[PDB]
Design an enzyme around this catalytic site. Structure first.
Site, mmCIF file in Angstrom:
data_model
loop_
_atom_site.group_PDB
_atom_site.id
_atom_site.type_symbol
_atom_site.label_atom_id
_atom_site.label_comp_id
_atom_site.label_asym_id
_atom_site.label_seq_id
_atom_site.Cartn_x
_atom_site.Cartn_y
_atom_site.Cartn_z
ATOM 1 N N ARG A 43 -18.160 -17.184 14.952
ATOM 2 C CA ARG A 43 -19.204 -18.176 14.692
ATOM 3 C C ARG A 43 -18.807 -18.922 13.439
ATOM 4 N NH1 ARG A 43 -24.496 -19.689 15.882
ATOM 5 N NH2 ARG A 43 -25.500 -20.753 14.140
ATOM 6 N N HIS A 72 0.833 -1.205 0.000
ATOM 7 C CA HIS A 72 0.000 0.000 0.000
ATOM 8 C C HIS A 72 0.858 1.242 0.000
ATOM 9 C CE1 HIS A 72 -4.242 -0.984 -0.045
ATOM 10 N NE2 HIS A 72 -4.049 -1.952 0.833
ATOM 11 N N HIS A 87 -1.585 -2.728 -5.327
ATOM 12 C CA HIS A 87 -0.898 -2.764 -4.044
ATOM 13 C C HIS A 87 -0.412 -4.185 -3.766
ATOM 14 C CE1 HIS A 87 -5.142 -3.405 -2.705
ATOM 15 N NE2 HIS A 87 -4.567 -4.301 -1.923
HETATM 16 N N1 LIG Z 1 -27.585 -17.164 13.312
HETATM 17 C C1 LIG Z 1 -27.531 -17.676 14.563
HETATM 18 C C2 LIG Z 1 -28.117 -18.908 14.879
HETATM 19 C C3 LIG Z 1 -28.013 -19.379 16.200
HETATM 20 N N2 LIG Z 1 -27.389 -18.634 17.136
HETATM 21 C C4 LIG Z 1 -27.132 -19.058 18.523
HETATM 22 C C5 LIG Z 1 -28.201 -19.743 19.372
HETATM 23 C C6 LIG Z 1 -27.427 -20.776 20.168
HETATM 24 O O1 LIG Z 1 -27.014 -20.250 21.447
HETATM 25 C C7 LIG Z 1 -26.215 -21.107 19.305
HETATM 26 C C8 LIG Z 1 -26.382 -22.416 18.539
HETATM 27 O O2 LIG Z 1 -27.400 -22.246 17.567
HETATM 28 P P1 LIG Z 1 -27.529 -23.150 16.268
HETATM 29 O O3 LIG Z 1 -28.751 -22.616 15.576
HETATM 30 O O4 LIG Z 1 -26.220 -23.117 15.511
HETATM 31 O O5 LIG Z 1 -27.737 -24.593 16.969
HETATM 32 P P2 LIG Z 1 -28.819 -25.746 16.653
HETATM 33 O O6 LIG Z 1 -28.615 -26.723 17.772
HETATM 34 O O7 LIG Z 1 -30.179 -25.158 16.431
HETATM 35 O O8 LIG Z 1 -28.368 -26.275 15.192
HETATM 36 P P3 LIG Z 1 -27.928 -27.791 14.742
HETATM 37 O O9 LIG Z 1 -28.412 -28.735 15.778
HETATM 38 O O10 LIG Z 1 -28.622 -27.946 13.429
HETATM 39 O O11 LIG Z 1 -26.448 -27.628 14.660
HETATM 40 O O12 LIG Z 1 -26.060 -20.014 18.401
HETATM 41 C C9 LIG Z 1 -26.788 -17.425 16.751
HETATM 42 O O13 LIG Z 1 -26.182 -16.760 17.600
HETATM 43 N N3 LIG Z 1 -26.862 -16.965 15.495
#
Ligand SMILES: Nc1ccn([C@H]2C[C@H](O)[C@@H](COP(=O)(O)OP(=O)(O)OP(=O)(O)O)O2)c(=O)n1
Ligand SMILES: Nc1ccn([C@H]2C[C@H](O)[C@@H](COP(=O)(O)OP(=O)(O)OP(=O)(O)O)O2)c(=O)n1
Ligand SMILES: Nc1ccn([C@H]2C[C@H](O)[C@@H](COP(=O)(O)OP(=O)(O)OP(=O)(O)O)O2)c(=O)n1
Ligand SMILES: [Mg+2]
Ligand SMILES: [Mg+2]
Ligand SMILES: [Mg+2]
Ligand SMILES: [Mg+2]
Lengths: 481, 481, 493, 493
Positions: D227, D109, D132
């Site tokens: 995540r 840069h 860059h």
């Molecule tokens: N877009 C999202 C979806 C879920 N959650 C949160 C809620 C829970 O505290 C944690 C886990 O959610 P998941 O939806 O990934 O878990 P599941 O158990 O529903 O999904 P699976 O069993 O299909 O893995 O993440 C989040 O922060 N953001």
């Protein structure tokens, strides 16, 4: 038209057009090129923030406080004129800072020009005067209801304190005394300047702020104290006020007096000292100034910012070779080596007149250790750091007035005993840090022996790593075990 | 399969299937219905959080710390078994809390059952035992490499300390001593339990946390101290450790011992006391228990949560009328009235055996003031609050071991003098708060006269608003001016 | 004790409350009076996100603290508009009335919030048409009458009859049947847009829940309400004075509705949260004949009938869950058993998700028939189990920008820097080609009440076959969960 | 001093650094070695957002701290993948190489970041094609060679020749001309997707700047990279091992690119920030003949030629702005004067914004001709002034999801809960109907260099007339800024 500006600390702020006028000048914009924490950026990589954005925040909070007091107490007769004058003082309080902020008036100028007594605040008055005069501000002030002569005076007083050596102020009378307590509170240090930097420095440093200025504003009233109308805090908020000064001390401890940050400031200062004869800065009427003399001419000083570091670093002039070489050691991270830290023990204070003599003392210590190297006075740096609650030995809370729920217009005092037995017993202390400019293993080992011996000789506190860094020395002192 | 769960404090956390198994039981899920800060929610509207989410966080941080130590020092031979056992202790540390957390074992049980000596930690061991036995956990533990008999014992020791009255632990030997310092650190109080609640309580309360647990983890090592392997902090982090206990004290000051929060806890307790003869909770083998006796049967105790408040509030039983009436005064915000606050002065300590006698003393004071009302002992509440650094009179930092940069495997000690003169001179104190159950203007005015007179008689500290609330009383004591 | 211009100064110290979202808030004594009643305090015992807490462990927050925040923001917005435009003649009376509407908007929520009027009442009492907003009016009326609020209102400059009416209108919309409002005239139309904005959904209610829900959920909010306030003005639109946004803020307004949709997607319509809400509702349905709640004049009500009596309804909160869970009555055993399955985490199993394809809409009258359709599918797969209609749950979820098929930005007025008093309109095409082309859609979730591995495997085959038969979208995991089914549909390949 | 299993324990204490975004980060000594060089430290003097600081006063951050964060996150992602899937045989050598690429990605840069290769070099040196990223390879080569890094690399298990090559490929893509990479084989393909993901743009570079830029700008980030890491796996796609996201995270991935577009919209393409970048560039152009920068062997270079010599380029940072601003050389007076207008806030004036309507694209070869078109418009308005081509600036801005017209999600592979090693694809229709229908667009901004009120009023008339003549979209403020012009176009009404 007002402008809205988005600040990460305070969010969306409104700027009155008069403020905008002051902001959009070379004298104010200059603060974009001066780091708030100076060398701290070289230790805390988030600390990239400059004085500019801090000044905006101080201007904003000053207005916030004054407005809040006025809305709650019309009887104070705070005008929009008063509000603007306090905002302007808030904006302009830092105009006198130099390259790397506290490095400049704290380390460089004392060394480069021992005969002068210079402070950034005095600098701010001069630069403010220069800003006003060079940019035709006075008519604009008039246009918005200010009375330039009185109000310019008032602003300067807010910045630097009383301008003459009894109500000592001319810009506003005793019934508006509380206006002098907003930007820079000389009485007890509770001001909006701290409030902005706590929040801003924490945001950039990666340390969380634990003081809540908004709560303070909500519990603030103005009450008669002697013949003045002064800001008073709610009585039960006294604990939070003690915590406020505790927070300031923690930030100084962790960040502003960081042992490496300070050594970077030191090295930059050494480089400036090596460069000072060779760098030219053009001021008023074409006259040349140096880094050390730019403070005598606001036109030159306007062009003296952190850029000086890079001018040196990128220079090819052989005469700048020594200066350049120091800055290159910063880049390679070949810094002076920390040896240790200690404090005085008794009622004992190290006087400023004696600071210069300390490296010789350390060098003159006689450690009963066989050493492969002998070190001289010039090989040691001794940094004496005053840590206090902002008023030397005094408890600032002794200079705060409070009010009670049952009688909100009546000012009272609260003593330390009435609060808590877990509070500090003293409000000032000194830290002594020692470094060595010889960086090899053997010099460093020798330096530690001299240092710990010196602490023993002077009856200073035992360094925390004393038994490890100097096992042959620590047994001789049984005050230490 | 592991689960990922999103926690606002710690973000996305992984839960081992064994942990999930423990979590998805009536005994653990119960913690969803117990507020972390009890009556605090009625003062801090953000403090809606329950013990459940705190326990998850403690379980998570315990794992984080143990993992970090193990990755850095393989020579410690931390196994995944050890990690799971510490996580489980972290999860289960709070299982023994009752309705409104500290209200229950702090206020209600001492009053409802003076003959017993009950603590939530003892409760946690019993509930953990009950969780394990009722849900077939032992085989699941085996399936994941745990040795149930030894490891269940180890978990209980982590929760409550040594189970027998010399290395006093059986679950793990001296070379894994550091494992006992993670969840509940009986030696110096530096543990992950604090780390979670600082961050979580601050997030909900609207007060900012100023302690950085992640920094602590990064500077933590395990070193030989005597014949144990113990957790040691880096020497220069001592200041931050003092700040950690300072933060705990500020949170207690601002939030956990809030003068109104405490009075709400008091009123809820009074209601429970009025209800205790009439509410039935079915336990093991159909046997009936009371609110005060549910602690003797984990099956009943499982069903004793904050819901008891609403059972009372919504009840129609005439026998619950008195209890119900107290809770309705909470709803209408007709609370007992704060009178003031004071402290002892000398080396003076108020003994617990004397607490009960204090309201009579206040009532027996003879203020030289003409009063329209006379007040009795039963009209006053006297709350004596112990504020300390977690180890009574002792400085916890005297029980911390440190290491130095130059010798990272060598444990050392640091004294208070070696750190700072701005630190607390004492580490424990008492706050005395007085309230009046008569709420009219005239009773309150009278109550203040008795209170300030009592402070004067006892040579206690002058209340902060003394001159305002009792102007005729404060002059008699010139220790006060 | 002190005087200025010869008149005694009166010091009326407001109550201050610390909220983690908005910080230190001042409450006018009239607001305090309303807050410190059984009817308002009730909201402490109703979770904002209902079953969401059982998925997002940070989502412990209750309607109480949300209501405080809405009351506060309503006051903030009205104040800001009035400060910038004195010509509007916003009075402190108007400010109080909007704050009160903000505080009281949620008074009608039942146990677990949207679970109650969204799932339980429709099932427990199909003959009624009930909404929490209608509930709020009734509860507000009850709060006012039971606590002697009217004189207190008078004491602070309100005109009870007109203003109580005005508050109710702010909460529920026009109460009758052309300017359709009676509490305030067309020149104060903008006051109806603050708490609950029926015209385009831009209101302070959203602003509080975006910030509060995000704080508790552990998802970061990306909408800036304070920026919006700074760029808000009131301008004449037709014969009304309406709130207008600065023109260049249009992108941010689209983003606001994007955020709302993301929160619904991630959190409020979470597939497990919804199934927990479903299970709680089933438990309530099994308990509804046996739980008694005492209302006015000693009359007994049920969970499903408590909505007919505000005195009983006052005592209907999330506590009903624990009453059931802790009950020993044998008649509550079925209800109890469902809640215990929640605790043991033996939940109904998610099977999958699909959507309609064309302009195709699933009508609400057809929802009930969907589980039979799924069960009647004939998957060409060898299965150990056969599943019935009653084994399937089919949840049809409407996801939209708050106004069904409509673009809310088509119902927003804007102003320009050069002419700040002139209202204008901005079309979608004037903004960006990267924006949504539709503003509403349906998600179809299917679950199975049989939880063993064999039933679940079978359920996936029936589900994907059903999607194929109905020309719905291919489930995202279709090729994995039903490899033998997905090839038959070449629109899918 | 201590022993375990009969062997001395060596304690190698890593450097710890505190970053406000990522907290306390550990730096491997090899990384430290690279960081503590003139070539890396240089990034302290180059603002991340260039002229953006002159609009967003919090945006004081430099490329240095961003680079540290990217280096850190690259290590985080690689570690996490390796911990979950030992079968990938990720070595600590691989980890270091990805960290180094992360650290060094931005070495090329220039002054004010995107201003330099986006605005200045194209204008100062049309004959060259410079980026860059190419700069970063050259500077990296120079950093390695000038500082004796190769032996240090060897000391920590790297194979310099292969690994240096690998690092460069991570930075700039394939260096030549079928697996197109030489530093690592197809079974470690996923390593090329970490720092700079040429296939779909999902990389750690974005993750750091989303979080860091938001922190400094005062806009909240709504993407959660942690995540993502938790839901990331490596699966076989064709003959490569590639990073795959969990299927149900697809919505979040769409949101990720939505966030990037919102940040570009709000901040990086801010209409004033861009004009400041434009003015700074103009100043550099007026200074370019007179500023000398000493490079290798004492050779002199200019601002525009410093890119040809890494030794000179090392000394080309944001300092050049201040060198100009503080200069006294009369030959720098024109350049100086432009920067002084920045300080006095006498900026070129924004006129408006429009877009093309059809499938219509403005080609880059036509950009230069646009100001003449605007000037040649004939507005039916009585004006005090006539404006020329040179008075107008026309900025054409490409806004897209990072892959021109393409949907990046079409180039993402996913996995399902039930079969975590099987890669699958998800189409737009399988997700949501509320998503963008296009993934690229052009914004056309017009500005005027004449700043008086009369010229500005005239400029608006020419601009709106030009939009009408070209069948572009109606400017949002069209009816206000040019009421006499907008009626002629009935597509607009
Ligand atoms: N877009 C999202 C979806 C879920 N959650 C949160 C809620 C829970 O505290 C944690 C886990 O959610 P998941 O939806 O990934 O878990 P599941 O158990 O529903 O999904 P699976 O069993 O299909 O893995 O993440 C989040 O922060 N953001
Ligand atoms: N979506 C946006 C747009 C801008 N800003 C920031 C940058 C500035 O600090 C402040 C003001 O920006 P504006 O774009 O609103 O200000 P202008 O001066 O560009 O707009 P105008 O003059 O047209 O009002 O807000 C922001 O945070 N979010
Ligand atoms: N140090 C403190 C003390 C209290 N609070 C919170 C709790 C409440 O939500 C709000 C008001 O608390 P106060 O302690 O100021 O209010 P009281 O009503 O208890 O005090 P008083 O009646 O004496 O004014 O502030 C806080 O954030 N920080
Ligand atoms: Mg502007
Ligand atoms: Mg799951
Ligand atoms: Mg109070
Ligand atoms: Mg170091």
């Amino acid at each position: 038209t007002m402008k809205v500006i988005n600040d990460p600390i305070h969010g969306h702020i409104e700027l009155h057009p008069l403020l905008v006028r002051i902001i959009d000048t070379p004298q104010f914009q200059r603060l974009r090129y001066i780091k708030q924490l100076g060398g701290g950026y070289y230790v805390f990589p988030g600390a990239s923030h400059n004085r500019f954005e801090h000044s905006l925040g101080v201007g904003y909070l000053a207005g916030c406080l004054v407005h809040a007091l006025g809305e709650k107490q019309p009887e104070l007769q705070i005008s929009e004129r008063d509000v603007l004058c306090v905002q302007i003082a808030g904006l302009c309080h830092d105009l006198g800072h130099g390259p790397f902020s506290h490095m400049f008036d704290g380390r460089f100028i004392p060394l480069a020009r021992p005969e002068v007594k210079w402070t950034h605040e005095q600098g701010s008055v001069m630069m403010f005067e220069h800003l006003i005069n060079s940019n035709g501000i006075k008519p604009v002030m008039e246009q918005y209801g200010l009375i330039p002569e009185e109000d310019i005076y008032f602003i300067k007083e807010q910045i630097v304190g009383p301008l003459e050596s009894l109500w000592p102020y001319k810009g506003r009378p005793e019934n508006k005394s509380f206006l002098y307590e907003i930007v820079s509170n000389k009485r007890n240090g509770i001001d909006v300047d701290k409030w902005d930097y706590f929040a801003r420095d924490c945001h950039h440093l990666g340390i969380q702020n634990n003081f809540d200025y908004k709560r303070f504003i909500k519990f603030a009233r103005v009450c008669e104290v002697d013949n003045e109308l002064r800001i008073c805090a709610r009585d039960k908020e006294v604990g939070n006020l003690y915590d406020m000064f505790h927070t300031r001390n923690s930030l100084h401890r962790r960040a502003y007096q960081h042992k490496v940050g300070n050594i970077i400031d030191t090295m930059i200062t050494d480089a400036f000292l090596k460069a000072d004869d060779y760098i030219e800065i053009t001021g008023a009427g074409g006259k040349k100034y140096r880094i050390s003399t730019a403070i005598d001419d606001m036109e030159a000083y306007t062009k003296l910012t952190d850029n000086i570091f890079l001018e040196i670093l990128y220079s090819t002039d052989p005469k700048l070779k020594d200066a350049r070489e120091i800055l290159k050691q910063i880049e390679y991270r070949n810094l002076f080596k920390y040896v240790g830290e200690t404090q005085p023990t008794g009622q004992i204070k190290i006087k400023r007149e004696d600071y210069e003599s300390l490296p010789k003392e350390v060098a003159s210590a006689k450690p009963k250790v066989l050493l492969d190297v002998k070190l001289k006075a010039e090989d040691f740096i001794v940094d004496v750091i005053n840590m206090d609650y902002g008023m030397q030995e005094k408890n600032p809370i002794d200079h705060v007035s409070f009010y009670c729920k049952t009688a909100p217009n009546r000012a009272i005092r609260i003593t330390k005993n009435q609060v808590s037995q877990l509070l500090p017993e003293k409000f000032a202390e000194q830290l002594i840090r020692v470094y060595c400019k010889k960086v090899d293993r053997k010099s460093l080992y020798a330096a530690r022996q001299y240092f710990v011996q010196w602490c023993a000789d002077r009856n200073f506190t035992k360094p925390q790593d004393g038994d490890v860094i100097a096992p042959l020395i620590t047994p001789q002192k049984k005050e230490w075990n």
